[PDB]
Amino acid sequence: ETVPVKLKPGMDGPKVKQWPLTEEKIKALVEICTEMEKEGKISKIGPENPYNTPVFAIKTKWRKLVDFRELNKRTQDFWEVQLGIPHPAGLKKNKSVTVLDVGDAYFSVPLDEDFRKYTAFTIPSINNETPGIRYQYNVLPQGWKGSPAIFQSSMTKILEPFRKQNPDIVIYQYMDDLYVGSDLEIGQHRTKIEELRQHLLRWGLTGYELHPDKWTVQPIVLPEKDSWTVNDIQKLVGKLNWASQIYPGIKVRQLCKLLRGTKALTEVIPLTEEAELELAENREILKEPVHGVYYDPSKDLIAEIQKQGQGQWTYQIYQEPFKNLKTGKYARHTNDVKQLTEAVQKITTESIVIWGKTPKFKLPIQKETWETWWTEYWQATWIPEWEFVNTPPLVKLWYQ
């Protein structure tokens, strides 16, 4: 018995263009889809289905990735409020969190007949030889936020003996993945994951290891200097001027005093003691969390990334600009696009662990280069929302 799925009123299904795919990805998808069809998971469709969702291939085995971003936004009432999955606050406090792919579970649950048309996707051909190969889903699709929402009840039943036997193990389902946390020693943790895989293995379903307790802030670092130049104080005042827009209690009055008259940039200007007091007092505030900043569940999360050079990237997560919920850094035969996708995926997984939702990314790359290359390195089964931004020149050095 299929659960009926109703779209958000006033808006209809997704009509998103399929991106050009290489020959190897097309052939990989044709092979996958021929197989799913024989198994009745998907069916070939007619032209009377005007809907479309993009499809991609990722990795040694090729796997299908359906971009349900638009369908998910259009079904938000269903998966978020109607059939919401509660996020545990304890997960971010665990010594180890193991991420397990549980997407194969969804293929055993039939999709509501009157919702299937909205899961439409096309396999394109090279040089437009043939019209695309069109399919729709007959079962809960991987990548659609409604799939874990519907499967919720079956997941609870599967995990019930395990949860009863392990009361201090946190299990969170987000999209196609299970997040399993414990404060156990690494060996005992890995032993309990194998036990859970055995439980999953009895219902069909078949890792990636995080350490959230070791996740720490990227404080705005103020230099430690032997001798300070006019240029160094100027760099320091701008950096402090901006940190004061986010942190309660920052002061620059004493440091600003030093900058009197029109001086040469290289002039070594001997420091004071009250200026030294400011530095140390600001340093103290900079290492601690931001006072008065709390996550609002009704608001979207934003992630900002800056290229810092030498394979280093900085990022900030916020809901209101300046108001940082989390800051961090990512460090690397790796290119900028490969480094950027790795950072996006790392920031998303931390965001899932901490808030139970993905951020919208502000990416310092050209829309087109990102659109051509992102899949070459993408490894997750989810895709966050993203925008293309032109990184302001000073945000970079203030986060350096």
Binding site for ligand 5MA (CB under 6 A): 86, 91, 93-94, 97, 99, 170, 172, 179-181, 210-212, 294
Instruction: Measure Cα distances from 73 to 14, 67, 189, 192, 387 in Å.
Output: 10, 12, 36, 36, 16
For a copy of itself, which stretch binds (CB under 8 A), given 95-103, 171-179, 210-218, 319-327?
171-179
- Residue 23 sits in the site that holds a copy of itself (CB under 8 A): yes
Give the separation between CA 90 and CA 209, rounded to whole angstroms: 17
355 interface partner picked from a copy of itself, ligand 5MA, none, CB below 5 to 8 A per type: a copy of itself
> Shortest approach of ligand 5MA to residue 354 CB, angstroms?
11
- Phi, psi at 140, each rounded to 5°: -55, 120
Binding to a copy of itself by CB under 8 A, coded x per residue (else -) over 371-390, reads -xxxxxxxxxxx-------x
- Residue 153 sits in the site that holds a copy of itself (CB under 8 A): yes
Instruction: Measure Cα distances from 375 to 4, 181, 197 in Å.
Output: 33, 29, 29
Placement of tokens 């395990």 in the chain? 162
Give the separation between CA 337 and CA 3, rounded to whole angstroms: 41
Answer yes or no: is 296 a known binding residue: no
Answer yes or no: is 101 a known binding residue: yes
- Residue 145 sits in the site that holds a copy of itself (CB under 8 A): no
Residue 234 CB neighbours (<10 A): 14
Phi and psi based region of residue 49 (left: phi greater than 0; alpha: psi -120 to 50; beta: remaining): beta
The alpha carbon of residue 148 and the mean position of all alpha carbons in its chain are separated, in whole angstroms, by 17
114 interface partner picked from a copy of itself, ligand 5MA, none, CB below 5 to 8 A per type: none
Instruction: Measure Cα distances from 44 to 33, 35, 116, 252 in Å.
Output: 10, 12, 12, 66
Give the separation between CA 315 and CA 218, rounded to whole angstroms: 9
> Shortest approach of a copy of itself to residue 103 CB, angstroms?
21
For a copy of itself, which stretch binds (CB under 8 A), given 101-109, 136-144, 169-177, 204-212?
169-177
- Residue in 197, 222, 238, 293 binding a copy of itself, rule: CB under 8 A: 238
For 4, residues 6+ apart whose C-beta sits below 8 A from its C-beta are 112, 114, 115
Give the separation between CA 340 and CA 311, rounded to whole angstroms: 10
Binding to a copy of itself by CB under 8 A, coded x per residue (else -) over 29-68, reads -----------------xxxxxxx----------------
Query: Which residue type does 167 have?
Result: P
- Residue 309 sits in the site that holds a copy of itself (CB under 8 A): yes
Burial class (CB in 10 A: 0-12, 13-18, 19+), 10: exposed
Answer yes or no: is 183 a known binding residue: no
Closer by beta carbon to a copy of itself, 187 or else 310 = 310
Closer by beta carbon to a copy of itself, 6 or else 291 = 6
Closer by beta carbon to ligand 5MA, 181 or else 384 = 181
247 interface partner picked from ligand 5MA, a copy of itself, none, CB below 5 to 8 A per type: none
Residue 87, both tokens:
């996020």
Closer by beta carbon to a copy of itself, 36 or else 109 = 109
> Shortest approach of ligand 5MA to residue 163 CB, angstroms?
13
| Angle ∠(345,350,351) on CA atoms, nearest 5 | 95
For a copy of itself, which stretch binds (CB under 8 A), given 201-209, 270-278, 322-330, 336-344?
336-344
- Residue in 218, 254, 391, 400 binding a copy of itself, rule: CB under 8 A: 391
Contact 66, 141 (CB under 8 A): yes
21 interface partner picked from a copy of itself, ligand 5MA, none, CB below 5 to 8 A per type: a copy of itself
DSSP state of 280: H
- Residue 161 sits in the site that holds a copy of itself (CB under 8 A): no
Contact 210, 97 (CB under 8 A): yes
Closer by beta carbon to a copy of itself, 63 or else 163 = 163
Give the separation between CA 186 and CA 214, rounded to whole angstroms: 14
- Residue in 229, 254, 312, 400 binding a copy of itself, rule: CB under 8 A: 229
Residues annotated within the binding site are: 101, 176-177
Residues annotated within the binding site for Mg(2+) are: 101, 176-177
